[PDB]
Structure formats: structure tokens, C-alpha cells
């Protein structure tokens, strides 16, 4: 179960075609995690959802409703 990566030789991890967020960083864009019987997998981490914007020179999207959110910022 040997996967060659740009950061070295990774042994014991099941290489997966899919792409997820990073869980345990390895390097060179490869991260590993423990998920589905269950085993450690390695994959190319993803940067987020792909989302094009419906641009046109006479079209505007204007919000009709709003949400009030509260976030927590913690500083030493």
C-alpha cells in the first residue's frame, strides 16, 4: 500500500482520487485523514467549491433579504 508523493514515500495510506479539505498535512499539496473497514487515506487537497459568476454587462444581483450573524474572535 505504497504511495509516492513529492514530499517522500508514504506507506500505509490508501491513495484516493477524490479531493477533500486538509485534515493532516503532509506536504506538496497532499493531506491525509482517517475515514472510510476504516483506514488512513491520502489525497490531493481541494481549495473549495468551484463556482462561476453569471457575469453580463447589463445584469445586477441585488439582495432582497439579510441575515444578522455573530462570530467569535479569540485573541491572546
Amino acid at each position: 500500500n505504497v504511495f509516492q508523493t513529492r514530499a517522500g514515500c508514504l506507506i500505509g495510506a490508501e491513495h484516493v482520487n477524490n479531493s477533500y479539505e486538509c485534515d493532516i498535512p503532509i506536504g506538496a499539496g497532499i493531506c491525509a485523514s482517517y475515514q472510510t473497514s476504516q483506514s488512513i487515506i491520502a489525497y490531493t487537497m481541494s481549495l473549495g467549491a468551484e463556482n462561476s459568476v453569471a457575469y453580463s454587462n447589463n445584469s445586477i444581483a441585488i439582495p432582497t433579504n439579510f441575515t444578522i450573524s455573530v462570530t467569535t474572535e479569540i485573541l491572546p
Binding site: 445586477i60 441585488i62 439582495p63 432582497t64 439579510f66 444578522i68 467569535t72 491572546p76
Partner: protein
Amino acid sequence: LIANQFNSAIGKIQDSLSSTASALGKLQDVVNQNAQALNTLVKQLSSNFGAISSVLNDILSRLDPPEAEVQIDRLITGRLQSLQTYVTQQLIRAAEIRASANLAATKMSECVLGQSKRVDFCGKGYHLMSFPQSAPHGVVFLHVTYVPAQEKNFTTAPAICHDGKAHFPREGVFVSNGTHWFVTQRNFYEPQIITTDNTFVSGNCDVVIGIVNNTVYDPLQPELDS
């Protein structure tokens, strides 16, 4: 509606804190680093550094002074170097905390005592207010932000020809729901009839790219006719 959304948003903070321990990682790491650094300093007393014993009394209790003096010098050199390493680590680490303390003071002034136009400085969204809360060796900010929620596709135009002159909005954009033209705000769809009080005039039709045809209703006309 706004008050109820605020009250629920605060309630979610309590549920988040009461279950997720990792939320306070930025403060737990500071406590852990200082305890971890201090324990290393203590363990260094058990090292020989080349002497016959890590215990100072055992050298004195077994050697007469002309010999003990060399054995002790090895322990002093090793233990003195250990303190310099610790102190240097604290001086660098203390500088890191001060930068955070200076940042926390900046947020307190520009986020609690006022209202920021700085993007993402006071939470993601259009900032309304923040509330400070204390924590062990740190500060916690609750940032209340306005986030646009639902949107519609409207057709727009940069200006409007009515009598050969180009009319531009005073505040907001021109939109059309497909058949009629209105002027509305930026961040909340609220249509208004285009009047002489919503718009201002500049130039004529021939220079602006994308101007459309409509009528700007004049509120004074029906008042003098009647």
C-alpha cells in the same frame, strides 16, 4: 425580525462553546507552551553535562575541594547555558504576545468603541457592533455583522435619457423587473419611481455607453396643473 435573529445568533454561541473544546485553542497553546518550556528547564537539573553526578551534594560529599572544583564547573556551565536558552525563548515568545496584545487593543478601540469600514477586520460581513468578553489570558470578541441573504436578477442601466439629457441616480442603481425602470438602494432591493428628486442631470444622450430610454416623473407638474 432583526431582534429575533440577533437573539438566536447569541444563543448559538453558547451551544458552540458548550460542546467544542477546540474553540479556545489560541489560548490553550499559550498556556501549554509556557508549561512545556518550564518543565524542560526543570529536567535539565538531572543531566550530568560531563560531571560524575547530576547531584551537586554528591560531588562535595565524595571529593575534596581541589578535585570537586573541576567537576562543579561542568555543572555550572551546563546549567547556566540552560537558563540563557530559556530566557531567550521567553523574550521571543513575549514579543509575539505583545503583537497580539497590540492587535487586541486596536480591535477594542475600533470595533467596540466605534464602527469599522475596514473589510474583514471586525468579522466577515458589514460590521455593526462588537462586544468584548474576558477569557483566561486573552480577550474574546463577539462581532455582529450584516450579511446579504437573498438576491434576484435584475436588468440594469448606467443612465437614463428622458428629454435628451442623461439622468444618473443620486444614491443606488437603476434596475428593471423586465418592463419598468426603478431606482433602488445598493444592499436591499427597494424599488422607487424615478423622479427629479432621485436623479441628477449631466450632459446629453450621446456620450454615455449603455444609456436607455424612459421617463423621469416630475412631481411638480401635477401640482401646478391642479
